Amino acid sequence: MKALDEPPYLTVGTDVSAKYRGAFCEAKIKTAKRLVKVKVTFRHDSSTVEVQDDHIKGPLKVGAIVEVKNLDGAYQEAVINKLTDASWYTVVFDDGDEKTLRRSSLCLKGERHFAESETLDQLPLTNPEHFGTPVIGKKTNRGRRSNHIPE
């Protein structure tokens, strides 16, 4: 660090509160995992997504067209915008689960484990009805009917 402006830090062996399925359960850092999360612009849709380095095949550098293996099973052409240090801490829960979560979803066990819950509340929303981008009619690849079926 430079000035060390954040004294509480998470390290292996340290017990923290990890958000498991929505509820913060106290688990201890089993290991620290630097995940490289790559923010990529999908070339076919122009949308910026943020995916794990694991799905990125090719070279990991800004401006590079890489091939993203999506969970859909499709490789997609995308451009790397940035490589993000996603320092996630892999915590071991006392039920036997181990999972890495980002430090923003981890509260340091120094008498802090949240006296709250989100409660999966669905009233306060910041995202409106996402039905797509305005004017659906700007894509180059089209192919309805193709004279194969009267549709």
UniProtKB/Swiss-Prot annotation:
It comes from the Eukaryota. It is found in: Nucleus; Cytoplasm. The chain holds residues 1 to 151 of 1312 of the full protein. The C-terminus mediates interaction with mSin3A corepressor complex. The N-terminus is involved in transcriptional repression by HDAC-independent mechanisms. Highly expressed in the testis and in breast, lung, colon, pancreatic and ovarian cancers. Expressed at low levels in the thymus, prostate and ovary. Component of a Sin3A corepressor complex consisting of SIN3A, SAP130, SUDS3/SAP45, SAP180, HDAC1 and HDAC2. Interacts with ARID4A. Interacts with AR. This is AT-rich interactive domain-containing protein 4B. Acts as a transcriptional repressor. May function in the assembly and/or enzymatic activity of the Sin3A corepressor complex or in mediating interactions between the complex and other regulatory complexes. Plays a role in the regulation of epigenetic modifications at the PWS/AS imprinting center near the SNRPN promoter, where it might function as part of a complex with RB1 and ARID4A. Involved in spermatogenesis, together with ARID4A, where it functions as a transcriptional coactivator for AR (androgen receptor) and enhances expression of genes required for sperm maturation. Residues 124-151 are annotated as: Disordered.
